[PDB]
Nucleic acid binder design. Structure first.
Length: 103
RNA sequence: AUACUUACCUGGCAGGGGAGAUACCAUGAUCACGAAGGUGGUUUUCCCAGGGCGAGGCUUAUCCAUUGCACUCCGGAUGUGC
């Protein structure tokens, strides 16, 4: 990602203040990274003592999409950002086996 | 209702008798006439599995016939289960 897209330029700093956002822009405009980046900053800067939890307590974040097709787009991009950072992403969507999903 | 599209939930794999035997047919088998066999038929014997046909018999009631002398069951009809 060589340069921030417009939505990224403005939404990222608002997200870094923990503020809610309504972003008006269409898919293809770099929305996904705009919301992913403040989340990754937050997660990876928690103290290790605080990133510690022994029981599984579900996700730090949920990203809801209207369609399976859009959800998968988001997933692919989330993986490519999250893996290098040791951040795990799971897709709960239709068109996939419930065994695989359940697992 | 039907067809497709997207999203969500779901998601094991594999099959269709078996085992013998076949002298005969095909496979016209690459070494001086030939393989054996295997494979595919055919026929047949086992292990047998599900159907078809229902002769005969068992059981019980309505109607009909019967007043009959036997000691070899045993008139007709119709219907539920066997």
């Amino acid at each position: 990602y060589k340069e921030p897209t417009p939505i990224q330029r403005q939404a990222i700093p608002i997200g870094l203040q923990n503020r809610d956002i309504i972003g008006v822009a269409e898919t293809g405009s770099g929305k996904t990274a705009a919301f992913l980046i403040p989340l990754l900053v937050w997660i990876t800067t928690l103290p290790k003592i605080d990133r510690i939890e022994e029981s599984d307590q579900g996700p730090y974040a949920i990203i809801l999409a209207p369609t399976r097709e859009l959800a998968q787009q988001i997933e692919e991009e989330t993986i490519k950002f999250g893996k290098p950072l040791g951040i795990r992403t799971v897709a709960v969507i239709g068109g996939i086996s419930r065994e695989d999903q359940g697992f």
